[PDB]
């Protein structure tokens, strides 16, 4: 028992005062006022710019290999790749990061000539800072991974070459120094360099041995004369209740009739008595 207009919403049917059901507009005395005013400043000042515009229209094509892109766009592509690469947690040691930084540095070296950006002094302060940060990061990663990958010396040498062609003397000298250091420090970590040196259990590991010793000494002592070596049972299991208070099912005491009644067959007439 509930009336409900299917064609129209009930609220829309009910709100008689808000809407008008009649659809005929009659003249009568229903005058309407059309008032239009304007000012001289509306002719020039305060004109909005529409969102859609043919000037800011771009056809975006895609390609996978980096060589297709110009160096200017290739630098942004490399940085976009490094954005997702730098989230990898490897204790800031690796080879892929050094390769990516080397690719960015090679992009700078190419754009020096093909991209006609100019020289290091020609490049303003912010891009100088970006270049210095990139080369320093490449050097740090190459040094970190040098002891494992013996090609980090080549990475550092290419970075030094790129600094040379970018004409940064202060960074080039440091790159020369670090390349000289690494070219002789790379072989130290290997085994043949240090034949003098050679190659501990945890607390849990030692306590496991202690427990095993106790179990064995109880086994040989009481395994035959009196089987009391069994540990205390945990057959009672906690079940979660209203406020997560663990309820424990205490086993029934022997001095009750419940277990005596339970052990008997349910139907004496039909169930076997043996």
């Amino acid at each position: 028992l509930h009336q409900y207009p299917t064609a129209r919403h009930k609220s829309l049917v009910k709100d008689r005062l808000r809407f008008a059901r009649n659809w005929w507009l009659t003249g009568g005395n229903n005058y309407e006022l059309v008032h239009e005013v304007g000012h001289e400043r509306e002719a020039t000042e305060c004109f909005a710019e529409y969102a859609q515009d043919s000037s800011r229209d771009v056809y975006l094509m895609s390609t996978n290999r980096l060589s297709d892109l110009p160096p200017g766009d290739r630098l942004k592509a490399i940085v976009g790749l490094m954005r997702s690469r730098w989230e990898v947690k490897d204790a800031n040691r690796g080879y892929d990061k050094a390769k990516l930084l080397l690719q960015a540095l090679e992009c700078f070296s190419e754009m020096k000539a093909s991209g006609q950006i100019g020289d290091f002094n020609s490049l303003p302060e912010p891009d100088q800072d970006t270049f210095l940060q990139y080369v320093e990061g490449c050097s740090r990663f190459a040094q970190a991974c040098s002891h494992s990958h013996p090609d980090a010396v080549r990475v550092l040498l290419r970075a030094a070459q790129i600094c040379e062609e970018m004409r940064c003397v202060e960074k080039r000298d440091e790159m020369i120094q670090v390349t000289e250091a690494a070219a002789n420090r790379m072989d130290r970590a290997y085994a043949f360099s240090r034949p003098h040196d050679t190659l501990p259990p945890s607390l849990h590991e030692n306590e496991d041995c202690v427990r095993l010793k106790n179990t064995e000494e109880l086994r040989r002592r009481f395994g035959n004369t009196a089987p009391h070596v069994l540990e205390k049972p945990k057959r009672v299991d906690c079940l979660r209740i209203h406020r997560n208070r663990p309820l424990l099912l205490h086993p029934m005491k022997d001095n009750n009739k419940l277990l005596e009644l339970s052990k008997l067959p349910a139907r004496p007439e039909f169930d076997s008595w043996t």
Binding site: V34, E36, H39, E40, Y50, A51, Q52, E125, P126
Partner: protein, 100 residues
Amino acid sequence: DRWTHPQESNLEQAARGSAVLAKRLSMTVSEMHDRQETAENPATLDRFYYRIQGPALEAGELKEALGLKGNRKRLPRRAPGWATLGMEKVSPQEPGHAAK
């Protein structure tokens, strides 16, 4: 705001301003001085009372054709930033790109 002041296109704004300029130029200096219609005051382009009798839907179509009512025109979307022209061509909202 959008109810009291309906949005209108830049072409309509320019047309309104040019109509005001034309009315001001057509007016004479003596009558302008008498009426105190200096360039500061906004000029009233027109004002009239109309009366329309007929079916509601056809009256709506007629008014839309005559430009008497709007409320359904799809005006172009405005720029996300400062929509007013003449702003700096390159201006990032976040400065960023800082060193040290």
